[PDB]
Write a protein that binds this ligand. Structure first.
Ligand code: CL
Ligand code: MG
Ligand code: NA
Ligand code: NA
Ligand code: NA
Lengths: 129, 129, 129
């Protein structure tokens, strides 16, 4: 079956456990991050990946992220292209804190799945619809 | 056709009307909810469902939700897996209010569609990409 | 390959036709938009589109949108059904400003892709799951 190659920041990153096929996959904070109310921090997830050809990954918060950490994801959903596959192309969670909050290294703060890229399209200008 | 089994919380919930196939499907607040500026409320949607095998649902705000209700969805997009199919597995909309607001029972406050879960993937750790 | 008809607000709008290979496609502010901290504005994108039959479009912010402009998208992810294909069906980015900001005419502000609508489903009410 088609594979994703994963490289981790260092040996202290908890490896993504064996997955239940089809499920979205959780991602972990790579270090402790403190964020003050109304402030923004790009949280490292200590992974870089080579996605299957023609695929992209979508990243959103876990259901309990707001409840547990009082952050929102500022891009709503991160889109990661197949091309973002290099040796230092690490993934981040863009968190805005709605209250004072502490995120612990290892905390499962967002989740991802892969999806085929959209079919090739051609956009054609018309004067009226 | 693929069947979605749906259970309503009680007799007073307005039933999901006959759908136009393909279109996202609107969901309604199960109760009146007051939310003060800068506070958070889980809004009951009054429904639990068994989705098609190999699928998941995605839930987002309706276009008019902010204008009408002054709230954002704190998880960005809700993911509901096929396995969330229990008699007690009700759906909620996690609302953060950017202003004082009152959501009324019946209000179509978000929408959902089903989508096939991601294919078989094999994560392989590598030293370098 | 799949055709999308595009109509622009006026001749000053930046045309976005190029050979596509499945990447998301960037949309741009149709005019200057100034938003104050804790205020909301619909940002015009200066485009109306006829999507391929059976398809919908999804819109999200760009990765750098928050960093550069300090706005979030209030609906999280915009959904644009194939049915929004009329001559005045212009596209908007619903922007909530977390700090004072200035979006300039021509600025890339968000990104879209298309996706096949969800297949036909039959919703069936049950007394219990
Ligand atoms: Cl582009
Ligand atoms: Mg505030
Ligand atoms: Na850890
Ligand atoms: Na009602
Ligand atoms: Na960007």
């Amino acid at each position: 079956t088609m594979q994703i190659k994963i490289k981790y920041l260092d040996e202290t990153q908890t490896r993504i456990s064996k997955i239940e096929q089809g499920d979205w996959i959780d991602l972990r904070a790579a270090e402790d991050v403190t964020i003050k109310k109304d402030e923004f921090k790009l949280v490292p997830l200590g992974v870089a990946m080579e996605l299957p050809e023609g695929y992209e990954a979508h990243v959103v918060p876990r259901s309990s992220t707001y409840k547990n950490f009082g952050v929102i994801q500022t891009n709503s959903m991160g889109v990661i292209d197949e091309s973002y596959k290099g040796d230092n192309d690490f993934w981040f969670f863009p968190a805005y804190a709605l209250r004072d909050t502490e995120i612990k290294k290892g905390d499962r703060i967002c989740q991802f799945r892969i999806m085929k890229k959209m079919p090739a399209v051609e956009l054609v200008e018309v004067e009226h619809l």
